[PDB]
RNA sequence: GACGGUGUUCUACGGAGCAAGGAGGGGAUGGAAGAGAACAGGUCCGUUAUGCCCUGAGAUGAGGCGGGCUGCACGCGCACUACGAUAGAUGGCGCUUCUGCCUGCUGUGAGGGAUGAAGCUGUGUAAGGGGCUUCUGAACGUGGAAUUCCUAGUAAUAGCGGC
């Protein structure tokens, strides 16, 4: 193996406060973050220009500095608007892609804002009952 | 009137192995080349166990030292490939 | 022009073989020559008939076979029969017919159903169960 | 045409795939590096230049049948959809991929209009050059 | 389950007693006779009256 | 124009050394692939008209996620017979008949009495039963060795035949026969 | 160009009308005493036998089979003894 | 080991019709002998043995 | 016009096994059918079928509008999808055919796909019920005593029609 595969790799990588595994390929390794699947992680690693066939452990600070910024806003690298998990917000009106620690804070505010107005879907979703049309008499115990 | 024997008395995922190597250093690549040339049948599974490396990497080692080395492919499917050494 | 035609059927597949006489051997299943065929069952079932009736008895024939309906394994057993019962219908009219009577004996010791048709038929379904024999699960309490 | 059944269909696709890239006249979709090619899929095509191997797939069989519509193309490039706790079903490709290849060929002046024969002499003469090269 | 009922046995004894010297020991001959003598409709019934007769004859 | 079962292996010089199993192992119906739809194999005496290489292939399409995959079992047999040939240098069709012989028992144990006279007797086994038990132990050691391991099914077939045709103590088929025979002579 | 068409539900009384018209048209302007016999048509329905929800559940399928023959004999003003049959559904175009 | 060819099928007497009594005929030195087998045996068959000293009846 | 008819091995002359020849072989296959009795079996919610009782204008009759039959600590019966390399992903070949075949990636929780979020849409008087796109990603490591269906083009696998 002259040049097919590397000679030494880093076993740990730190992006966005999560320890990526450094022995996997690039598009798969980014899926440890919360907000990145395999269908948007492989789009970012294609507009940037990263080689799809390269372990994440073998990367300089130049690449990990670029794609760690592309993940903040993917609309600047050039992905369409219909790919982000939070479009057209109900409080200001701007599209975005919440990621990591800003996911669980977003729905937790929904449940609280909906109890002041005494909604019904925000009382069932708070004590863990099924909110879409399912029938709760034999399943879900 | 009570689920008392439908509960499963089992265990905790009987112990696992260590992760396999994904890097190939030169001195061991020259050890694979030591005795892989006087063999009748060499597969990517026989290699990835003696040296404990990921079976996707174990074949690139064979593809590489098949170009100039002693091995040579004698048949290949999508689910197997065999390399017969040229003694 | 010297020509014949035959028919083969296996389950609900049907094939036809037009056998002319040019001076070279050849096969063409569905307009594809007998070198680019990818069905490895179509090549192993159709070249053990060319070994049970020797090659020399057919040096200057060119068969054209067709098969447009049915499963996959069934389709082979229909091409395989229109091709075998055309080496005989040719030796009946334009060749030594005592040479048609012995290779017809050599094909029948190999298998009776490379000249005749399998009569096994699919069974209907009865209510109270998902097939012909099986029934739905009973419950005792 | 005739003689298109004599050549191995996997070498014909590679023989005018590399030929198409060397003309610089084809323009791919609005974006083809980001999309998956149908509704019953999960991930994007592993290759990088599927759009040229996919166009020469349509040009082989525009010359077998002689006329292709934008509903037979969707119906021919489908997949099996994984529906969860149900059994799976068959769905076709996106209707948008099939028509964008029927206009790249038109602007390059290959397919004329005809519902019973879609190829011009400049198309029949070009296809006949790839048959005789990969015997 | 190859037993012959009474209407098909009881008939073959009436035939073997009246037209007896018209019958010999092959199936294709005795079937030609029961088409001449008897008047039934089902082609399965003559086939069994004729097949029971050829066993009676060589007995 | 002779027929070799994959265009490489001949059916003569495949002599079955035994004398009681000889009229029951069918090396007579040749073919260049173990696939033959027929009707002459139905019946109380049609169990001896199945080719021997077809009895062993149809043992592998089991556990109904694999029901009716016979072409995929035929593909996996082309490759196992390549490893058996280039590794041991002998006929791969003749080392499968030596495994069936060295893996079928010759005596078992039955019950007679009723709950106070339950008595482990000893019986012998006719030939046709001695082959249904050999084929079923060879294939059940091949299915275990491949379930959750990284080994391929065609290499799990090769190791199991080159070890049963020599009585090597590494075979699941032969160790499982020697308990049957040892036990079946202690109840006597 | 005469064209007689037949159709009915029972067949033991459609063969009579296609044989009684065999001889009363033999010695006339037309000839070729024959009648084509098309393949029949079928309509099926499947239902439950039980008039409530008790017992074993048992099904039964009904059929409406329809035979039909054809006639083609060009003549000129040669009938009303065809309209005197109880079940066959005569048609004369 | 020894051998023998079945020449008479006495009957099927097992717990649930499993075994089948039979009358073998050893071949290295001719001797009729009774014996119980387990598989689907016919007449003319030749079975093996590994000791010929029991008759079972 | 296929009859255990012909040969063969046993028979109580009732018949049974195994062979050949044959498009078809042992009730030719699968269904449909099915005397006379019984049960206090089910149905008055199927019927302008029906005895008796009950109800009668703020009607136990006829319409119109909203709600419910879909509520959820828990016990049970039939099913669908899984626990992976005999595999998953992506492409090619077959077309008015098919539920298959070949295949660069994955060497193991890239197996599994419940639950919930944001945005787009169809039917209809009325829908967070029905579809689609990005994200979230459970339990599950082949299952205790018991127990169901099955003898050949069948069991089991993968599907398409109709009601």
From Swiss-Prot, chain A:
Gene Ontology cellular component terms for the protein in this record: cytosol; small ribosomal subunit
Main location class: cytoplasm
UniProt keyword annotation of RNA-binding present: yes
Record localization: Cytoplasm
Any Gene Ontology biological process: translation
Transmembrane segments annotated in the record for this chain: none
Gene Ontology MF annotations: rRNA binding; structural constituent of ribosome
Keyword terms: Cytoplasm, Ribonucleoprotein, Ribosomal protein, RNA-binding, rRNA-binding
Cited PANTHER family: 30S RIBOSOMAL PROTEIN S13/40S RIBOSOMAL PROTEIN S18, SMALL RIBOSOMAL SUBUNIT PROTEIN US13
Entry's family note: Belongs to the universal ribosomal protein uS13 family.
Function: Located at the top of the head of the 40S subunit, it contacts several helices of the 18S rRNA.
Name the UniProt record assigns to this protein: Small ribosomal subunit protein uS13
Species this protein is from: Encephalitozoon cuniculi (strain GB-M1) (Microsporidian parasite)
Gene that specifies this protein: RPS18
From Swiss-Prot, chain D:
Record's keyword annotation contains Cytoplasm: yes
Compartments in which it is found: Cytoplasm
Classification via Pfam families: Ribosomal_S19e (PF01090)
GO MF, one example: RNA binding
SUPFAM superfamilies for the chain: Winged helix' DNA-binding domain
The keyword Lipid biosynthesis is annotated on this UniProt entry: no
Alphabetical GO biological process terms: ribosomal small subunit assembly; translation
Keywords from the UniProt entry: Cytoplasm, Ribonucleoprotein, Ribosomal protein
GO cellular component, one term: cytosolic small ribosomal subunit
Similarity remark: Belongs to the eukaryotic ribosomal protein eS19 family.
Matches recorded under PANTHER family: 40S RIBOSOMAL PROTEIN S19
Assembly mode: Component of the small ribosomal subunit.
Name listed for the protein in its UniProt record: Small ribosomal subunit protein eS19
Lineage of the species this protein comes from: Eukaryota, Fungi, Fungi incertae sedis, Microsporidia, Unikaryonidae
Swiss-Prot record, chain E:
Cell compartment(s), UniProt: Cytoplasm
Subunit field text: Component of the small ribosomal subunit.
Family: Belongs to the eukaryotic ribosomal protein eS17 family.
Full protein name: Small ribosomal subunit protein eS17
Organism: Encephalitozoon cuniculi (strain GB-M1)
From Swiss-Prot, chain F:
Gene Ontology process terms (BP): translation
Example of a GO MF term: structural constituent of ribosome
GO cellular component term of the entry, any: small ribosomal subunit
Subcellular location: Cytoplasm
Keywords: Cytoplasm, Ribonucleoprotein, Ribosomal protein
Keyword Ribonucleoprotein: yes
Pfam families: Ribosomal_S7
Family per record: Belongs to the universal ribosomal protein uS7 family.
Database matches in PANTHER family: RIBOSOMAL PROTEIN S7
NCBIfam families to which the protein is assigned, alphabetical: uS7_euk_arch (TIGR01028)
Assembly information from the UniProt record: Component of the small ribosomal subunit.
Protein name (database record): Small ribosomal subunit protein uS7
Lineage: Eukaryota, Fungi, Fungi incertae sedis, Microsporidia, Unikaryonidae
């Amino acid at each position: 193996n002259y040049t097919y595969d590397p000679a030494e790799v880093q076993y740990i990588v730190r992006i966005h406060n999560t320890n990526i595994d450094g022995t996997k390929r690039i598009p798969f390794a980014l899926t440890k973050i919360r907000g990145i699947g395999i269908r948007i992680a492989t789009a970012i690693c294609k507009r940037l220009g990263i080689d799809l066939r390269k372990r994440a452990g073998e990367m300089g600070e130049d690449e990990m500095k670029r794609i760690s910024d592309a993940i903040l806003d993917p609309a600047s690298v050039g992905i369409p608007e219909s790919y982000m998990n939070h479009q057209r917000d109900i409080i200001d009106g701007t599209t975005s892609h919440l990621i990591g620690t800003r996911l669980d804070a977003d729905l937790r505010m929904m449940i609280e804002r909906g109890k002041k107005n005494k909604r019904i879907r925000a009382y069932r979703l708070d004590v863990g009952l099924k909110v879409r049309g399912q029938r709760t008499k034999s399943n879900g115990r | 009137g009570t689920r008392k024997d439908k509960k499963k008395w089992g265990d905790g995922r009987k112990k696992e192995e260590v992760r396999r190597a994904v890097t190939v250093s030169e001195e061991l690549l020259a050890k694979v080349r030591k005795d892989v040339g006087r063999a009748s049948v060499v597969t990517r599974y026989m290699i990835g166990s003696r040296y404990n490396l990921n079976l996707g990497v174990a074949e690139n080692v064979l593809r590489h030292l098949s170009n100039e080395g002693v091995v040579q492919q004698v048949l290949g499917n999508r689910r197997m490939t065999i390399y017969a050494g040229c003694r | 022009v010297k020509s014949v035609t035959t028919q083969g059927k296996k389950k609900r597949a049907v094939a036809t073989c037009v056998c002319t006489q040019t001076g070279e051997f050849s096969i063409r299943i569905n307009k594809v020559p007998f070198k680019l065929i990818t069905n490895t069952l179509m090549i192993a079932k159709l070249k053990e008939i060319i070994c049970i009736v020797e090659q020399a008895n057919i040096k200057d024939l060119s068969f054209d076979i067709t098969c447009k309906i049915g499963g996959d394994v069934s389709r082979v057993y229909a091409v395989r029969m229109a091709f075998a019962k055309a080496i005989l219908a040719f030796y009946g009219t334009y060749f030594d017919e005592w040479k048609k009577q012995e290779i017809q004996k050599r094909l029948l010791d190999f298998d009776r159903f490379s000249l005749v048709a399998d009569s096994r038929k699919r069974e209907p379904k009865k209510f109270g169960g998902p097939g012909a024999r099986a029934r739905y699960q009973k419950s005792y309490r | 045409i005739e003689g298109i059944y004599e050549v191995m269909p996997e070498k014909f696709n590679e023989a005018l795939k590399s030929y198409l890239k060397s003309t610089n006249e084809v323009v791919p979709l609005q974006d083809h590096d980001i999309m998956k090619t149908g509704e019953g899929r999960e991930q994007a095509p592993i290759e990088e230049d599927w759009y040229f191997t996919r166009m020469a797939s349509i040009v082989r069989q525009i010359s077998i049948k002689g006329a292709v519509t934008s509903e037979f193309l969707a119906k021919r490039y489908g997949s099996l959809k994984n529906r969860g706790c149900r059994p799976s079903k068959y769905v076709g490709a996106y209707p948008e991929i099939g028509e964008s290849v029927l206009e790249n060929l038109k602007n390059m002046g290959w397919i004329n209009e005809h519902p019973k024969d879609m190829l011009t002499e400049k198309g029949k003469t070009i296809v006949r050059e790839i048959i005789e090269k990969v015997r | 389950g190859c037993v012959r009922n009474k209407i098909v046995k009881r008939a073959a004894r009436t035939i073997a007693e009246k037209y007896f010297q018209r019958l010999d020991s092959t199936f294709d001959h005795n079937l030609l006779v029961v088409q001449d003598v008897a008047v039934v409709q089902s082609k399965k019934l003559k086939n069994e009256i004729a097949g029971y007769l050829t066993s009676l004859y060589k007995k | 124009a002779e027929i070799n079962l994959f265009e490489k292996y001949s059916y003569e010089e495949v002599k079955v050394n035994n004398v009681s199993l000889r009229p029951y192992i069918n090396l007579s119906r040749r073919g260049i692939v173990p696939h033959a739809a027929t009707t002459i194999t139905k019946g109380t005496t049609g169990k001896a008209r199945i080719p021997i290489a077809e009895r062993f292939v149809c043992s592998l399409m089991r556990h109904g996620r694999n029901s009716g995959k016979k072409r995929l079992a035929i593909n996996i047999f082309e490759d196992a017979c390549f490893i058996i040939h280039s590794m041991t240098k002998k006929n791969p069709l003749q080392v499968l008949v030596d495994a069936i012989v060295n893996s079928g028992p010759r005596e078992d144990t039955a019950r007679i009495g009723r709950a106070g006279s339950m008595r482990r007797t000893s019986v012998d086994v006719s030939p046709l039963k001695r082959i249904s038990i050999a084929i079923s132990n060879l294939s059940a050691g091949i299915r275990n060795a491949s379930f959750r391991n990284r080994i391929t099914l065609a290499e799990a077939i090769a190791n199991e035949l080159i070890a049963a045709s020599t009585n090597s103590q590494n075979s699941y088929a032969v160790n499982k026969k020697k308990e049957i025979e040892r036990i079946a002579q202690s109840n006597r | 160009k005469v064209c007689i068409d037949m159709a009915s539900l029972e067949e033991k009384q459609i063969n009579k009308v296609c044989r009684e018209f065999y001889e009363y048209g033999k010695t006339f302007i037309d000839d070729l005493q024959r009648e084509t016999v098309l393949p029949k048509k079928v309509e099926s329905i499947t239902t439950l036998r039980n008039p409530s929800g008790q017992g074993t559940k048992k099904w039964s399928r009904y059929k409406m089979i329809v035979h039909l023959r054809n006639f083609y004999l060009e003549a000129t003003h040669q009938v009303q003894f065809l309209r005197n049959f109880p079940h066959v559904e005569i048609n004369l175009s | 080991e020894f051998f023998g060819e079945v020449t008479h099928v006495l009957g099927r007497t097992g717990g649930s019709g499993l075994l089948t009594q039979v009358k073998m005929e050893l071949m290295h030195n001719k001797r009729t002998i009774q014996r119980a087998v387990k598989g689907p045996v016919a007449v003319g068959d030749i079975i093996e043995i590994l000791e010929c000293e029991r008759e079972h009846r």
